[PDB]
Amino acid sequence: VYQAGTHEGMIDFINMEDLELAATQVIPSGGYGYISSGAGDLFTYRENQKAFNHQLVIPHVLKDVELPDTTTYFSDETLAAPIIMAPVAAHGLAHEQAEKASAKGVSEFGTIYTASSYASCTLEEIRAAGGPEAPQWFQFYMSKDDGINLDILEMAKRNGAKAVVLTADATVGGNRETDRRNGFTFPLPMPIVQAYQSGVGQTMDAVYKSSKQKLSPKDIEFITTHSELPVYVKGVQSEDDVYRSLDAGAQGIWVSNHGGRQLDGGPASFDSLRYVAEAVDKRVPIVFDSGVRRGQHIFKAIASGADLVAIGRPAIYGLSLGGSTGIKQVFDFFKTELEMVMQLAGTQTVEDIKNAKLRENRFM
Amino acid sequence: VYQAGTHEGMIDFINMEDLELAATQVIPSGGYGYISSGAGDLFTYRENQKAFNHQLVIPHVLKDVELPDTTTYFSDETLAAPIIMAPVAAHGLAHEQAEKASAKGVSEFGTIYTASSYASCTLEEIRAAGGPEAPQWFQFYMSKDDGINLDILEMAKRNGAKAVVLTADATVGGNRETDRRNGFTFPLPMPIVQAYQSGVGQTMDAVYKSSKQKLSPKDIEFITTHSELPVYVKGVQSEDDVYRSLDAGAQGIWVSNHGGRQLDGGPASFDSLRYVAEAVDKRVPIVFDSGVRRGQHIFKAIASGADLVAIGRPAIYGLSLGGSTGIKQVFDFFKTELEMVMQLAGTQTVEDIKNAKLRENRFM
Amino acid sequence: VYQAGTHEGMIDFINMEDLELAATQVIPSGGYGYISSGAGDLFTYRENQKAFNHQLVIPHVLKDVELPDTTTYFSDETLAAPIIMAPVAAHGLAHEQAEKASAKGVSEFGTIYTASSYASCTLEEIRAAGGPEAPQWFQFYMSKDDGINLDILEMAKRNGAKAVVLTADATVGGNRETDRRNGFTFPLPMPIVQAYQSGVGQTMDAVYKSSKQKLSPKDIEFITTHSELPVYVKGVQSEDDVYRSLDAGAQGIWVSNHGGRQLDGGPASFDSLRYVAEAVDKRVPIVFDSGVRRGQHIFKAIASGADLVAIGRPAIYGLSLGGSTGIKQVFDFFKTELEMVMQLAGTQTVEDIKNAKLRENRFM
Amino acid sequence: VYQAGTHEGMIDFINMEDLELAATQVIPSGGYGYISSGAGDLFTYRENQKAFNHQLVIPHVLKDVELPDTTTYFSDETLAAPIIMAPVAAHGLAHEQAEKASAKGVSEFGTIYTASSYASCTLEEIRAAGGPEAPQWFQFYMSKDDGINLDILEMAKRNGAKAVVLTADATVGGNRETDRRNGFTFPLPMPIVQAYQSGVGQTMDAVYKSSKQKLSPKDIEFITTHSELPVYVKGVQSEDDVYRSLDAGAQGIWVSNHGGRQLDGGPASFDSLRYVAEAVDKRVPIVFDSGVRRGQHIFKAIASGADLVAIGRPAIYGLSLGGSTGIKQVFDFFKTELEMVMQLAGTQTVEDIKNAKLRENRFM
Numbered sequence A, B, C, D: 001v002y003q004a005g006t007h008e009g010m011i012d013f014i015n016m017e018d019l020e021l022a023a024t025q026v027i028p029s030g031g032y033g034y035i036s037s038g039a040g041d042l043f044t045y046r047e048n049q050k051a052f053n054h055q056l057v058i059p060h061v062l063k064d065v066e067l068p069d070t071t072t073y074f075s076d077e078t079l080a081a082p083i084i085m086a087p088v089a090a091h092g093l094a095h096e097q098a099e100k101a102s103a104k105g106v107s108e109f110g111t112i113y114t115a116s117s118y119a120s121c122t123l124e125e126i127r128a129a130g131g132p133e134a135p136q137w138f139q140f141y142m143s144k145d146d147g148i149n150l151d152i153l154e155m156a157k158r159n160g161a162k163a164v165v166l167t168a169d170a171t172v173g174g175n176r177e178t179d180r181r182n183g184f185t186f187p188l189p190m191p192i193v194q195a196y197q198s199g200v201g202q203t204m205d206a207v208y209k210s211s212k213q214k215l216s217p218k219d220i221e222f223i224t225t226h227s228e229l230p231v232y233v234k235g236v237q238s239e240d241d242v243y244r245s246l247d248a249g250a251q252g253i254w255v256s257n258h259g260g261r262q263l264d265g266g267p268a269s270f271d272s273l274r275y276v277a278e279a280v281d282k283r284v285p286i287v288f289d290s291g292v293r294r295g296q297h298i299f300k301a302i303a304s305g306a307d308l309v310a311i312g313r314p315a316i317y318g319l320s321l322g323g324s325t326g327i328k329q330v331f332d333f334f335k336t337e338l339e340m341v342m343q344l345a346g347t348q349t350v351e352d353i354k355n356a357k358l359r360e361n362r363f364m
């Protein structure tokens, strides 16, 4: 039997590194390997966190700032901070209460929750746990069957999704050698995609291969036609990918390399953000993720063209140790660090962060 | 008595690093040192594998790709993948069945086998083991005696060689200090070059010095005159070397630094490929080798101007552990990784890989 | 009870690294952690010392130099060397005699002493210990209350401060995780700021938050209006910060990142010095600090536009082990190294150092 | 009593790294520390050997080369190879037979021997040991007394010195902290400089301070006036130093940073060679040293503008273990490696090395 974390309450940590280590005590070895590792030789995975010091934040002085405000106005939403929950599969790997605990905690922090197509819970349970005023987005792993795709989009609409995130950088799984060494298989169902994927006893490789490989601009047009919700393309790391996405009617761009879990030997996401921000030229919102472990990383991403920054692994480690309380403590850690960075950089508001100029590191 | 690997069947490995370590259990210490190490302080040897992350592969999205096809049309050949066997001396160091096992396995995978002048078997045995439809090339370590050179070329013709690979970067042996520490000598004859070299009990240094040092463009003209087979020059790493080769009538260029076994303090082969591809300007085919351990390395070489990528040490480690089955499993490992990279990069066919644009890594 | 160093006399050390290690034997663990560590992941802290080899000193020959002279004419002062004491809080953490021992030792060496607002002693005790001819500057952590600010400035005037150093890069404390792990609190009062801060049992974070966060150019104008002393802005690392400071009437610029204790992910101070020196264009004096551990670091800073270089941690380690004798030995170590560097670089006087041209390191 | 090496005969080594380690068995700890270490934090010392891979040697093919010839015509001399003995103090630290053993071995190899002013033997003994046809140069540490300087120059003339090497980069000693830790003092006299320096029981720092600090172009004119021998300036690493030297009548330039023993935080000598070669523009010969441990290092220096390359520490380690036989084996190691590099680079003669083009390493 697979037994995940069961604690609901305050957790003890200093930073995201000791939090990651502490989670090894409550997540079964195979599940921990699935969450913690990445593709191939882990070049791209390691580069994600290193890349934030490719650009240096200037601690400006005499900027007439106190009590910096992380409050973020995004569409008709008011967020506590420009920090959201990334779509992460199978929260039941981390905590018994799974996406019910994560959706409740992110709702209570007061920011956007992105639900995974590969969730351990139904979208109905995710909406119920967050409450009716919780801002929730739906991340779509599409079927090869358009009937099933219409059914999943109608289901996202019923549950009040405010955007559809088409993940386009996992048409097949990466060469995740920790999963291979562990003989990893999923312990729980995936109810949202149950029409094409059963989850239980399936390999990582098998699950991605059950979804659609031949994604194209026609898939954005399909989602627009049948849902009327704004479409974000996730995995965008170049100008060519921006123009393909916007020409097909995308209303958002999500810069990511899937936390270094996919194509080893590719760039760090933070380096790609510069190319993507130039191509987008503020025409649509940008979400950024992959390697974020400090407030200074969030500041640098927003200064470089991100409107929102998404959190993956650190939120899952917090969930494993403390449930809803634990995941909210991780968002609070990032908000508290961002407030410190805003004061020392001289930015009163999130819009002021966007206008900050970083210095390129010539000696990395 | 020298006792190499004897197993014929499926081998257990994750990647080429644990395969290299596993081979230490079946290859005698001196033979393992000869295969595994390189020249001088090993700067050039280490740089070969590191250099693939000097250029970054973009994981494009919405590229309308599924079931990527590695099938490669090269001259009148149909190859399983754009991946061939490099010429490697003395396979009897690795497996009792030597080049009979390696030629059979590479034939069954369905790609080009390059036979070494310093083989443990005759070219007749190599042709017999591969079968009459197996695509085979002949790698030439020339004699100082032109009579012997005519005899060896007529022998290559009789055995249906489709190209002659003139190896030009080993006129003398490098300073291979592992061979010195081990007191390495060859345990087996070298029948192809028996007219000038006996093999048994000879040092690495002695064998290279028995071949021709004063290679020049006149040697390409000699091979053309007497064989009528296309000549590839192997070891080409600069524009000057391309023009010398093509002006003398070469019909192919093989970019290599001999797996870091020759001139320590020289460039990584993958970095040299850019200079060579610019000079060749698609006038003749390019083969690339040295440091290839992943599908992403093959993808990057082809995107950078290679038509074919050759495998050395990893194929020999597979041979040592599993014979024909083992060497085919190594080619299958590279083909399976290349299919994963093609799907995540957005390339349907090998010609699409050639049109991919890599991003230079400004933070190596 | 908190028990610091008590020795007054000569100490045994080779360089500042073994001095830092030796101090662990006499400074209580919590105090040692407070002095020795820095912010976040310590990127900026480590980069400070590494950055001095971003620029290379040319050992010129035949320069007609002997007995190089470090004597420095600064305003109406004659200093032994262009090397001064940085403002460092709470010397009682290091030695029982606290700022009485440090002010006496720096006076006897013959250079500027910068008194911290967060001193363990009164400014009256600091002036008494240095003697009436000792050059002393006052470092200001401002109150939120302008009445208290007028009182502190009148107090600096009474004690013969020759400049006011407005520290502007610590409006809040950095994420100093060693202090968090140690549960660090200050053991002694802070008499200079007693009107707003009691010191005893207070966290690092609490003390900075008791001072003024909303520093602006109006604060320079306030100090000028009420003290008539030259104002230096400390923490300046960019052109924008120079122009803000000078436009508000600053008569000096102090380039610093607070010894890597504040905004992790910011530049090394030595790299920032180039940008600041270009903007200042010799209009006002420049003080430089953060990471100085060798004479070559002082030489490089002065060649790059610094008029004076300030010493922090190394002076405190010397104080802990030897009191007034020990801190003077640290200044003597830096002066002796600077004399060696001046002879080998070919600079007879400090003005000659300013005219030296460094070579940028293209291979860091 | 100080007891150095006593063996005369063949020594067992692979490369200069295991030779350096083996010498620890025969050189007393204090002497070994004096020979093996360098200044300050050893940045410049470590950079010397690393810097050779800042520029990459192209292994050219089809260059029509065999039996490469290292024979070097320099002035009226015929050298075995473009490889000479650097001036190194006090060979009695390494071997009982001191400079008698080193001069005999270098004479028998057939190249230039540079005698140190701080030799353990007289120049008469050095000339007698080398024989009358041995090419010998005299390295000058000048006195503050011009009478003593005239006496030393007349002595160099009597002993048939063919050049005077004015060492200009050691006007004072570097901060050699191994010597400090060891309490190092010289065990033997320095007969050449006995008029101003006794040697026995003296520190490194004291010996350099007894020589002339205020070296200037007037000192080149003095040597020319009183000896009529060509003057080389040693320690030249910039254009300014070339023009100062040539304007004063120098007939040679010796590029060096004194093996990283002097100004820590300065450039690697191999990097400085490019700047010096451009300024000299073949107007006078260039000697190069500091960090040479391989044939590829000698090749790269000559391709970059050096006419001769000098050997320091490796020659002293060979001397300690094998006397005249041992030091000749070290020169033979370098000649044998240079022959291998010349064959693989495609250079028939030393003049061909000068015309080789290196590729700058963009990924160091």
Ligand SMILES: Cc1cc2c(cc1C)N(C[C@H](O)[C@H](O)[C@H](O)COP(=O)(O)O)c1[nH]c(=O)[nH]c(=O)c1N2
Binding pocket: A034, A035, A036, A086, A087, A088, A089, A116, A117, A118, A139, A167, A234, A256, A257, A258, A259, A260, A289, A290, A291, A292, A310, A311, A312, A313, A314
């Ligand atoms: C365990 C786990 C599982 C998933 C993911 C990640 C991880 C760690 N990610 C990728 C995710 O959205 C995000 O891009 C990364 O997690 C960001 O990198 P960091 O984890 O913050 O370093 C992911 N993305 C997505 O679109 N759908 C999914 O179902 C998942 N599943």
Ligand SMILES: Cc1cc2c(cc1C)N(C[C@H](O)[C@H](O)[C@H](O)COP(=O)(O)O)c1[nH]c(=O)[nH]c(=O)c1N2
Binding pocket: B034, B035, B036, B086, B087, B088, B089, B116, B117, B118, B139, B167, B234, B256, B257, B258, B259, B260, B289, B290, B291, B292, B310, B311, B312, B313, B314
């Ligand atoms: C044990 C061994 C033996 C040989 C070689 C290599 C090795 C490892 N190589 C060089 C070979 O063709 C190829 O360039 C390298 O092996 C490529 O580097 P990797 O081994 O893939 O890293 C080689 N090349 C050649 O032209 N003729 C030969 O006989 C040999 N022999």
Ligand SMILES: Cc1cc2c(cc1C)N(C[C@H](O)[C@H](O)[C@H](O)COP(=O)(O)O)c1[nH]c(=O)[nH]c(=O)c1N2
Binding pocket: C034, C035, C036, C086, C087, C088, C089, C116, C117, C118, C139, C167, C234, C256, C257, C258, C259, C260, C289, C290, C291, C292, C310, C311, C312, C313, C314
């Ligand atoms: C223990 C301690 C305490 C303080 C400081 C530093 C340290 C180490 N610093 C910063 C100081 O002035 C200086 O910028 C740095 O010390 C310089 O870096 P190094 O210590 O030389 O590496 C500091 N600066 C300031 O303006 N007022 C203060 O009260 C203090 N307090």
Ligand SMILES: Cc1cc2c(cc1C)N(C[C@H](O)[C@H](O)[C@H](O)COP(=O)(O)O)c1[nH]c(=O)[nH]c(=O)c1N2
Binding pocket: D034, D035, D036, D086, D087, D088, D089, D116, D117, D118, D139, D167, D234, D256, D257, D258, D259, D260, D289, D290, D291, D292, D310, D311, D312, D313, D314
């Ligand atoms: C033990 C020892 C002693 C000396 C030296 C070096 C060493 C190691 N060197 C410097 C020498 O000429 C040369 O520049 C360096 O040795 C070159 O660096 P490598 O030793 O080859 O790395 C030196 N130079 C000089 O001009 N006169 C001298 O008396 C000495 N003495």
